[PDB]
Design a protein around this ligand. Structure first.
Ligand code: FES
Ligand code: FES
Lengths: 109, 109
């Protein structure tokens, strides 16, 4: 229902992440093999940025504070310490523009 | 709504309760004669868990701290001290999977 233009698709190279924020909501955008995926930026186990850490392997991001891991496509936990999945956010690409609905974060089924 | 799997229905036997949570949102799931009902986990009168510190008799849960009571089907108060109804949450059963939408808590009319 409410998409916000956050960056150019070329701002998130394959295998990298980018933090974007709006209204006090922080979202991490990951580029996995040419497609973009959005999740809450903070690890669910602490106030620690998943994008600012720099550890993405394929579609699994690793929190650099305690090594927890999450699937960026679904937000699901792949390794503890975390026990809670990340919220994921609607993300669309229109031309070279990447848009995110910061008010629609949700947990994957 | 965006439903997420929170437990197996067999994890909440008849007459029992189970707490599930995501971020700061805690939900109590109660089994009343085979059907599951979801409410906020905390008593509205204090930081006290209705699933961990509640006694379920039929469809009425009693807060063990001051003996306030709520109907788990509607969240409405059945006995003081509480004066505010519990928020209730949408819950679905798909085979043996139990799903809730943590962002959709509401007050019964
Ligand atoms: S804060 Fe991320 S694993 Fe602990
Ligand atoms: S905290 Fe539940 S009745 Fe007071």
């Amino acid at each position: 229902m409410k998409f916000t233009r956050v960056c150019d698709r070329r701002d998130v190279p394959e295998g990298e992440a980018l933090k974007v924020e709006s209204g006090g909501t922080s979202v991490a955008i990951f580029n996995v093999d040419g497609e973009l995926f959005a999740t809450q930026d903070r690890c669910t186990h602490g106030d620690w940025s998943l994008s600012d850490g720099g550890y993405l392997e394929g579609d699994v991001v690793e929190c650099s504070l305690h090594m927890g891991k999450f699937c960026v496509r679904t937000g699901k936990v792949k390794s503890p310490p975390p026990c809670e999945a990340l919220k994921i956010f609607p993300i669309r690409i229109e031309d070279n523009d990447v848009l995110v609905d910061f008010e629609a974060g949700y947990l994957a089924p």
